[PDB]
Amino acid sequence: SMQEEDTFRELRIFLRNVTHRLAIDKRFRVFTKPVDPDEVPDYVTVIKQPMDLSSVISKIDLHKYLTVKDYLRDIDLICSNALEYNPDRDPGDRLIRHRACALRDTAYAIIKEELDEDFEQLCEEIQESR
């Protein structure tokens, strides 16, 4: 129904706004765009499901997220990927892991503070009925 579509529209607005806030933080610049295969040619052979914040925006707009849970799975994916591709003790790797965990903790904290859990529960029930 139109009321359900209004719910999902509100969702998308919220998710764009959260995503924008992450994307403008200097720490998270490395996660804002797909890894360039010129610069990192083995990335797409190691990491099976690449994700980044621009692609997250594309997915919002394509209506791929009907719940905040589905969105956060993609945030987790950005983090997991970074942990997996940069697993060493060297400083570069430790910095990107640190930032990847901060990306995740920051997304969860914003959501905790700003997402009414009855709103999420509604989205989840509409989704289960489809």
CATH of the domain at 31: 1.20.920.10
Q: What domain count does the chain have?
A: 1
Q: How many CB atoms lie within 10 A of CB 28?
A: 20
- Cα(122)–Cα(52) distance, integer angstroms: 27
> Which of 12, 116, 117 minimizes the C-alpha distance to 57?
12
Resolution (A): 2.0
> Which of 122, 89, 96 minimizes the C-alpha distance to 35?
96
Residue 20's alpha-carbon distances to 15, 40, 107, 121, in angstroms, are 8, 25, 11, 24
Residue 46: which domain range? 1-130
Q: Kindly provide the residue ranges of all beta strands, DSSP E only, lying in the chain, ordered along the sequence.
A: none
Residue 80's alpha-carbon distances to 31, 60, 75, 102, in angstroms, are 12, 20, 9, 12
- Cα(55)–Cα(61) distance, integer angstroms: 10
Q: Which two tokens stand for residue 39?
A: 């610069």
- Cα(22)–Cα(108) distance, integer angstroms: 11
> Which of 52, 50, 67, 49 minimizes the C-alpha distance to 19?
52
